[PDB]
Amino acid sequence: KNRGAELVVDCLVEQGVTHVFGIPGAKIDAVFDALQDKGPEIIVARHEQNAAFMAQAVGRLTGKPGVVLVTSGPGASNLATGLLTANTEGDPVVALAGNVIRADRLKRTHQSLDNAALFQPITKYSVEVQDVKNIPEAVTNAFRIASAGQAGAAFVSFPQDVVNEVTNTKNVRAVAAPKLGPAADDAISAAIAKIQTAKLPVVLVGMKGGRPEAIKAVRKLLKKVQLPFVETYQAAGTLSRDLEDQYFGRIGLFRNQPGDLLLEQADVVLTIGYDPIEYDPKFWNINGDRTIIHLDEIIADIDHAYQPDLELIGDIPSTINHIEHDAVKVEFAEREQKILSDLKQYMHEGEQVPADWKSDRAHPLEIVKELRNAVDDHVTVTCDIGSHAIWMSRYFRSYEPLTLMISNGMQTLGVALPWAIGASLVKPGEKVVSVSGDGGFLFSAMELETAVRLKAPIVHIVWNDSTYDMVAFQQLKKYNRTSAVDFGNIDIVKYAESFGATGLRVESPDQLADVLRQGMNAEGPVIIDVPVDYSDNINLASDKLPKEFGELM
Amino acid sequence: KNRGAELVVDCLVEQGVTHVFGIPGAKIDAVFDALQDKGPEIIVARHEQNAAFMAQAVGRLTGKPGVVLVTSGPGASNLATGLLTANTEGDPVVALAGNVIRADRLKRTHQSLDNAALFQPITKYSVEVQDVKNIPEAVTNAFRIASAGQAGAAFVSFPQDVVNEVTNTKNVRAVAAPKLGPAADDAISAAIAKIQTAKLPVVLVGMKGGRPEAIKAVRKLLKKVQLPFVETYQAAGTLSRDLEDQYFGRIGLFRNQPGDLLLEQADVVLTIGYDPIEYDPKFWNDRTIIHLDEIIADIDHAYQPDLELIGDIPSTINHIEHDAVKVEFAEREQKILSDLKQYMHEGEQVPADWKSDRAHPLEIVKELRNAVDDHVTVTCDIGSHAIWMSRYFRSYEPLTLMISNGMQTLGVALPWAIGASLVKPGEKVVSVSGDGGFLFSAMELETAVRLKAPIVHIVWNDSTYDMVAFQQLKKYNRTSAVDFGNIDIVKYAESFGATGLRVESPDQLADVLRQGMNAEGPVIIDVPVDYSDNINLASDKLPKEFGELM
Amino acid sequence: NRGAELVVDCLVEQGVTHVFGIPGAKIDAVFDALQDKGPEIIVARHEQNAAFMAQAVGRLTGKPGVVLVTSGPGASNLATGLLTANTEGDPVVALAGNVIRADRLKRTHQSLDNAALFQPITKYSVEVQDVKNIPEAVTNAFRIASAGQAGAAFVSFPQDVVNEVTNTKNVRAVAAPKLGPAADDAISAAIAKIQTAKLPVVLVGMKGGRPEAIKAVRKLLKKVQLPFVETYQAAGTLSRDLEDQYFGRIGLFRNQPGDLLLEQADVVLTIGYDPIEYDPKFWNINGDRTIIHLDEIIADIDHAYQPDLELIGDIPSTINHIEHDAVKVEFAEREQKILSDLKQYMHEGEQVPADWKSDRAHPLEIVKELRNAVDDHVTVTCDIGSHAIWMSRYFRSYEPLTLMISNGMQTLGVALPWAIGASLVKPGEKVVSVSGDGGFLFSAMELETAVRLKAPIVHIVWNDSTYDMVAFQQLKKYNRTSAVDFGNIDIVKYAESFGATGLRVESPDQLADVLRQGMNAEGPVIIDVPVDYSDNINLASDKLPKEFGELM
Numbered sequence A: 001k002n003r004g005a006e007l008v009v010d011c012l013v014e015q016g017v018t019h020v021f022g023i024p025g026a027k028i029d030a031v032f033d034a035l036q037d038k039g040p041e042i043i044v045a046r047h048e049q050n051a052a053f054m055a056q057a058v059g060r061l062t063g064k065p066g067v068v069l070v071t072s073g074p075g076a077s078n079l080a081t082g083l084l085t086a087n088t089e090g091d092p093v094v095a096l097a098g099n100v101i102r103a104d105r106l107k108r109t110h111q112s113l114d115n116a117a118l119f120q121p122i123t124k125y126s127v128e129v130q131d132v133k134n135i136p137e138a139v140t141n142a143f144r145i146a147s148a149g150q151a152g153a154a155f156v157s158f159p160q161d162v163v164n165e166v167t168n169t170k171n172v173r174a175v176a177a178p179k180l181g182p183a184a185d186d187a188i189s190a191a192i193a194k195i196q197t198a199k200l201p202v203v204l205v206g207m208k209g210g211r212p213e214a215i216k217a218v219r220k221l222l223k224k225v226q227l228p229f230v231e232t233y234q235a236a237g238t239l240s241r242d243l244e245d246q247y248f249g250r251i252g253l254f255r256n257q258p259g260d261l262l263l264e265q266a267d268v269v270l271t272i273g274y275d276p277i278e279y280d281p282k283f284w285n286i287n288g289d290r291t292i293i294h295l296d297e298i299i300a301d302i303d304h305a306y307q308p309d310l311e312l313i314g315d316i317p318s319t320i321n322h323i324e325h326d327a328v329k330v331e332f333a334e335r336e337q338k339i340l341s342d343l344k345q346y347m348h349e350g351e352q353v354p355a356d357w358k359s360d361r362a363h364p365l366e367i368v369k370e371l372r373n374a375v376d377d378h379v380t381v382t383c384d385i386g387s388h389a390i391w392m393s394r395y396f397r398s399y400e401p402l403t404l405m406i407s408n409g410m411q412t413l414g415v416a417l418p419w420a421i422g423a424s425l426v427k428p429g430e431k432v433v434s435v436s437g438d439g440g441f442l443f444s445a446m447e448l449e450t451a452v453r454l455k456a457p458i459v460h461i462v463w464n465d466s467t468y469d470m471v472a473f474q475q476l477k478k479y480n481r482t483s484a485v486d487f488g489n490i491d492i493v494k495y496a497e498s499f500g501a502t503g504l505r506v507e508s509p510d511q512l513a514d515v516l517r518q519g520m521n522a523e524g525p526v527i528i529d530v531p532v533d534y535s536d537n538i539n540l541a542s543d544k545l546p547k548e549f550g551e552l553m
Numbered sequence B: 001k002n003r004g005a006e007l008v009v010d011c012l013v014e015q016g017v018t019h020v021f022g023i024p025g026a027k028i029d030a031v032f033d034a035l036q037d038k039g040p041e042i043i044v045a046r047h048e049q050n051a052a053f054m055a056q057a058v059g060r061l062t063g064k065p066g067v068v069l070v071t072s073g074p075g076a077s078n079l080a081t082g083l084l085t086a087n088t089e090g091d092p093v094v095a096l097a098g099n100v101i102r103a104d105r106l107k108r109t110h111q112s113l114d115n116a117a118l119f120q121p122i123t124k125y126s127v128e129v130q131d132v133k134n135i136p137e138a139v140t141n142a143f144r145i146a147s148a149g150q151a152g153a154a155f156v157s158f159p160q161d162v163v164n165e166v167t168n169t170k171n172v173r174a175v176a177a178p179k180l181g182p183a184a185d186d187a188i189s190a191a192i193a194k195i196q197t198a199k200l201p202v203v204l205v206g207m208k209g210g211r212p213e214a215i216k217a218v219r220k221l222l223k224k225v226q227l228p229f230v231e232t233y234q235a236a237g238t239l240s241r242d243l244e245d246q247y248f249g250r251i252g253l254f255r256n257q258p259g260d261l262l263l264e265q266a267d268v269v270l271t272i273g274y275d276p277i278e279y280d281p282k283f284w285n286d287r288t289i290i291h292l293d294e295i296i297a298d299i300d301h302a303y304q305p306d307l308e309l310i311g312d313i314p315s316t317i318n319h320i321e322h323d324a325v326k327v328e329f330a331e332r333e334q335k336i337l338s339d340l341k342q343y344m345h346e347g348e349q350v351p352a353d354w355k356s357d358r359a360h361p362l363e364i365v366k367e368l369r370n371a372v373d374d375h376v377t378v379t380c381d382i383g384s385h386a387i388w389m390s391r392y393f394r395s396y397e398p399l400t401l402m403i404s405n406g407m408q409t410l411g412v413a414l415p416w417a418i419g420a421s422l423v424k425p426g427e428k429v430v431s432v433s434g435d436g437g438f439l440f441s442a443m444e445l446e447t448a449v450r451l452k453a454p455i456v457h458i459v460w461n462d463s464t465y466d467m468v469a470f471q472q473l474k475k476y477n478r479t480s481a482v483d484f485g486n487i488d489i490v491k492y493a494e495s496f497g498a499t500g501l502r503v504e505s506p507d508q509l510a511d512v513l514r515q516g517m518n519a520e521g522p523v524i525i526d527v528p529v530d531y532s533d534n535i536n537l538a539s540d541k542l543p544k545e546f547g548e549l550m
Numbered sequence C: 001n002r003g004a005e006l007v008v009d010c011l012v013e014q015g016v017t018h019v020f021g022i023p024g025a026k027i028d029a030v031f032d033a034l035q036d037k038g039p040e041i042i043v044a045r046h047e048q049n050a051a052f053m054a055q056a057v058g059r060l061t062g063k064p065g066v067v068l069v070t071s072g073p074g075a076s077n078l079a080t081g082l083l084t085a086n087t088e089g090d091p092v093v094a095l096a097g098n099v100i101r102a103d104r105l106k107r108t109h110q111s112l113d114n115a116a117l118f119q120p121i122t123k124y125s126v127e128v129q130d131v132k133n134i135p136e137a138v139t140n141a142f143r144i145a146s147a148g149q150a151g152a153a154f155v156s157f158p159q160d161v162v163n164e165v166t167n168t169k170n171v172r173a174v175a176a177p178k179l180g181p182a183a184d185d186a187i188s189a190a191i192a193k194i195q196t197a198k199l200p201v202v203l204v205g206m207k208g209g210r211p212e213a214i215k216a217v218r219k220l221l222k223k224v225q226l227p228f229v230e231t232y233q234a235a236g237t238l239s240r241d242l243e244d245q246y247f248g249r250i251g252l253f254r255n256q257p258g259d260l261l262l263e264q265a266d267v268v269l270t271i272g273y274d275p276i277e278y279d280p281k282f283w284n285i286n287g288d289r290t291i292i293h294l295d296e297i298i299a300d301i302d303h304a305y306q307p308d309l310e311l312i313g314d315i316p317s318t319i320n321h322i323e324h325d326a327v328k329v330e331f332a333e334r335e336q337k338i339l340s341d342l343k344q345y346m347h348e349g350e351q352v353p354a355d356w357k358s359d360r361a362h363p364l365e366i367v368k369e370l371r372n373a374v375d376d377h378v379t380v381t382c383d384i385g386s387h388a389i390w391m392s393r394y395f396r397s398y399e400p401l402t403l404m405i406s407n408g409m410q411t412l413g414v415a416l417p418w419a420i421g422a423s424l425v426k427p428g429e430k431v432v433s434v435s436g437d438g439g440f441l442f443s444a445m446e447l448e449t450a451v452r453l454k455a456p457i458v459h460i461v462w463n464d465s466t467y468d469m470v471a472f473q474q475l476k477k478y479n480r481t482s483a484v485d486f487g488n489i490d491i492v493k494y495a496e497s498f499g500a501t502g503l504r505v506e507s508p509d510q511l512a513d514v515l516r517q518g519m520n521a522e523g524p525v526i527i528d529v530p531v532d533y534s535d536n537i538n539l540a541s542d543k544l545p546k547e548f549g550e551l552m
């Protein structure tokens, strides 16, 4: 027909977009109509929030922006949290929304608002197209800006008459966002010289160290040079089994981990793709001066606790390849060897169920271990936010890039199950596991109809506690009392069944391994009800370990 | 304790707030801690979206700002649509949110976000407090601005260190937002002269005509002067059983209603609390226009008032009422009223050729109306079911039919009914949605079960996003992205510990509804509906027919 | 019959007689269309001064001043102007070009997000994106600019929108409506609270200074015989008749007779008071008093401003309903002495010091000689600086809108362009403008406009060669000054280089003569007046409050 609506779909075609997540409405209608003619499969969502969470997951797993498409008013405003989360967690997303006609743009009329103004503080790019000719230009720049370091959200709004208008405007080439070269050579030399002269150099692998390419390079570096290392939560998957000896776990949330003590003992820290939002430098870069080398695709944020002595800004993996090429293996003096050894066995003992533990419910560590034993390396595991997620983020081993997905920017409740859906659409054929608590679960459980309608092979684990617990034990450590943390329990099994899904329940902690295998062998979506004992949770924020190791030294 | 958090709680005590809807988090948890000592009852929500909707319900039904309280980051950003909805539909709401400590406000850090900039476009008032001393001032101005005509949403954000900081700061008095006087008296006189000299003077009651005091005033005006009148959807309940004779239905959505032809035939139109968002003037609007409202009018190609009576709406109405006298109509205009009233009765009727194993929409509306007492509040969601409710479900009390008619936001029905039941203890509350919108906020059924709220939720079961579908069929002759698969509604209800009912055949409709009305605790009722008559809601038939009788 | 014509037609419907502007490419179609029909175009030398002029028209006529500019630097130069009007109750409408809609998101000459820039400093900031919407968007801009509280409205036109040919019809210029008075029972309440006061006082503020409000205020002050004070923008509330009940203009520093009056008051009635002129935390202090807020909009709650009664509605109507039903207050003995003492403190504070000697005029001598040289009805515009403090406290005004002060943003350089605006509003009358030397250069360029118009402006420069108001605050805080010194210029030959008339006061004794000589001159005249500023630190001095505190 050649409306503005067709120009939009043509862009999606040039961009190689396989799927569009959305919900139709009167203002964005022409575009949905034009998608009937061609373009990517439409995945109808049961909420624009979840549509955004789905696009985000696609962006994180593929490196090309996930696409979400919604109508005016509440269609658009329901995107806010989603885009915010994508934009602060390094995920390429492009959002396309409708608005009222240009003539009525300033009026009190149904579903009218300044779309671009709302999304301005929460995206890299937020625009509204006021001329049909401009559509291919605006859309193409949004894809590029979404993809360019640091990846985030782009939002593009269309008045209704703009996408309905007939025009002879030509499309433009989907010129892909270009790669940077590696960092300046002189900076790379300096960086190598500082690692070679260190008594205890260590690698801090961050958000953008967690991309597949970045991880491949990071592993060659760690293997050649033999550096100890830690991961941020979104760097999970850096580990391989033959790096386990050099691995000191995941830093974050509370300063009481072996990784923290290691970074403390370090005189040189090399950070890679490090976005401080995952764990503020004021928690780890303390207690003594210490050289900081910042390896990233964008310049560093200066902070009282973060003043890099060296910045290597360029393409992350290739910059790493250049350091790797000219570094050599680091020898550790006796003192540092013993520090490393001691940290390693504090790390080991942390991963164990307390010896005087007895219960009629599973311990969190038992859930974590059993889950890890029932799931092959290649399977993507998505995680929600809560105490369950602390246990997962610290103790759930991951061995491949993009196989453990955590929301460690906004810490947005409800991402797991929708993320699992997006993952299954990117990895057709594979099982996708999603893990949540019972609080965050109802934030997005509605999208179980999408999963069933798609016959997605998703396995969702609900940690059953019956409170907002991560908030509860923090309230106990601050005020020795809780507030607004309690809610009623629902029948998770019958909930799943009412959707046409499958419900299982761990009725005793010894059925855990069995019920898990069963979910994995099931056809279509499964929800698994797991009673958990959270009485150990308060110890997640303990200072015992920093204190013990303190008197060691 | 004299933290900033206590200063906040004290404002809520001073303001007479009985419920705060919320979800706790680290940056805001000091205010939640302070609520353990004194202050209103915390209602824990399963989604900040839904806490916002409930606060909207409280605001619409009491005139006092509803209060929602949330944490930083996604806690705040999840309020967006809620406050947008409230802000455009006339409901006083106060939102309170956390943010990161002042010193880290500029950094990439967990749950950080320029809160105030995000709500700037979608509220009357959006601010972040940067000094603990300023807390009582910023909160007290928020309540005032939320309530002041035209009522809307107010947003206040608090850095973590500001609510945790110990302080000597004094509270301020909750100075009530003041009412205006009536409109200028020479303006009132002018309007009385326009009505008394018109051939067919008519009243259009709008959004802010649906406040209880405005309705009581409007009824006296209608009865005394015997003017015909029409309702926007949010002015539902202006009608009294007494006034059914002068009543010409609800205007909205498509121009093809008896009310539309009436407004067209009128030489004078008195609009009361008319927010054009409910129905753009370019659809119903030569003739004289008298704009009566608590704020000045927006000028539009199709809306240029000859008279503006700006002041307190009920005051101004009374003044007009006091000095106006009965209008009597020439025979020409009586015939017009007779005909329009007749077209109106035909439209309210199930078509003659209708055959179906599912209920017609009108049969749901009729049985619902016949099963619910006039005083029972009925909330409604968004979709094809709501076109039917908005046009054909009669309301006779103020605030007993609640419709989202500024932002048309899916999912408002069930959370509104929860807010409503906390505002009217001892009463049943009815809510109506389609199956699409039901899953937008059905999570909150846990909350209704937790409170043992006497809610009866009716689900119109179709299996599609239909209101989108038949507009699509009319524009392109094909649908797109409107199909989803259905769930077992009864089992969905039972899994939450609520009661689930199902109308298995159209004749069971009366009894099943009755059963729901007498049930204990929350009830969900599955009601299959036949929508194949839905595309005629946008039909041009009636204006074409009436065109040639003239 | 383009979009540009639609814009000119709206200006005609609003009764706009003058448009202050500077042309550019993106907006020039509108400038074209103004050749055919419309209001006179006054070419400015800087978009800042065009904005100031507009503000002046708005303040003086009650209908929006109009300013028209091009895209990019044309529009951005408007920022301080609209901001100042938007915080001082002045209706202004601004019209600006932008790039074509197709190139709106591009890096291209003079492209910027116009609406976003003006959102935080206007009541109303919009961009039209369809030619049809022009009559609507503009009409609402005039009404919103006018609707109380009055201020700045900004409309932006992408270039292709005003050049586009259309058959769109215009829209009626529906006047912004009036409110009625406050509600009866509230009026009753206010009268009752006043009746039972031992010392009720009136505070006249910003919107108490419109002509109709002043007419009603004067009747109320006369009938009930209440003492009153003024905010700076409430100048001209006073009449010669009312000098007896008058306790001066409050503001800037809490050390004036008006402050002490307010402090002793048990009931304060405020009239159209915008706190920006003087924070309530400065006067509403040592003890409690009842506050009655009378205004066209609800009050801002403050730690030091929590009204017991709000009278919201049209200000002159509400004042009238109070005047009609109130009877005279009669002060007891204790309060009469109080009022008497304060009145003498007031009178002593207006006199040049005893041991004053100087080769240059003392400020009060400038204030005095200028007041006596100028008819009551003549409009006097004032700039910002130490000279303005002297003007604002001590220069009497007896007619509405004859003393204009920037008391919201305290914007430098407003005087001279405000006087240009005044003279266009009041043809055939002298207009006097007063500035310091520093603020003079902020807008002195616009003298070319005044000469080009043969405007009868008489501009007085207080010459001391420093940014003094900053400097003495710096000394009272830090015992040292910073960045307050600049060179000076020959004001007389400055004026002459523009084809204007330049006069100089070579000695304080020829002050009356050089002033009278300026009043009789044809065309613009600038006057160089050397001043001695050594007294200036005593403006922020703390003695009067202390001395009176011991007198109690």
Ligand SMILES: Cc1ncc(C[n+]2csc(CCOP(=O)(O)OP(=O)(O)O)c2C)c(N)n1
Pocket: A384, A385, A386, A387, A388, A389, A410, A411, A412, A413, A436, A437, A438, A439, A440, A441, A463, A465, A467, A468, A469, A470, A471, B023, B024, B025, B026, B071, B074, B075, B078
């Ligand atoms: C959208 C949103 N609202 C509020 C919060 C604050 N918050 C963090 S954890 C949490 C509770 C999660 O509870 P649950 O999912 O049951 O996990 P659990 O701690 O019990 O394992 C809340 C409310 C948040 N992170 N996101």
Ligand SMILES: Cc1ncc(C[n+]2csc(CCOP(=O)(O)OP(=O)(O)O)c2C)c(N)n1
Pocket: A023, A024, A025, A026, A071, A074, A075, A078, B382, B383, B384, B385, B386, B407, B408, B409, B410, B433, B434, B435, B436, B437, B438, B460, B462, B463, B464, B465, B466, B467, B468
């Ligand atoms: C939050 C939001 N998303 C999308 C829309 C667009 N929209 C309007 S009606 C509608 C259909 C709702 O369907 P349903 O609840 O099943 O009611 P039905 O039409 O079937 O009666 C949609 C998607 C909207 N109004 N609000």
Ligand SMILES: Cc1ncc(C[n+]2csc(CCOP(=O)(O)OP(=O)(O)O)c2C)c(N)n1
Pocket: C384, C385, C386, C387, C388, C409, C410, C411, C412, C435, C436, C437, C438, C439, C440, C462, C464, C466, C467, C468, C469, C470
């Ligand atoms: C645009 C602007 N810049 C700076 C200031 C701060 N300021 C206030 S008074 C003042 C000094 C003005 O001095 P001048 O005009 O020479 O008059 P004087 O103080 O000498 O009497 C300054 C710089 C201001 N108010 N406005």
Ligand SMILES: [Mg+2]
Pocket: A386, A437, A438, A439, A463, A464, A465, A466, A467, A468, A469
């Ligand atoms: Mg839980």
Ligand SMILES: [Mg+2]
Pocket: B434, B435, B436, B460, B461, B462, B463, B464, B465, B466
């Ligand atoms: Mg449906």
Ligand SMILES: [Mg+2]
Pocket: C385, C436, C437, C438, C462, C463, C464, C465, C466, C467, C468
């Ligand atoms: Mg000076």
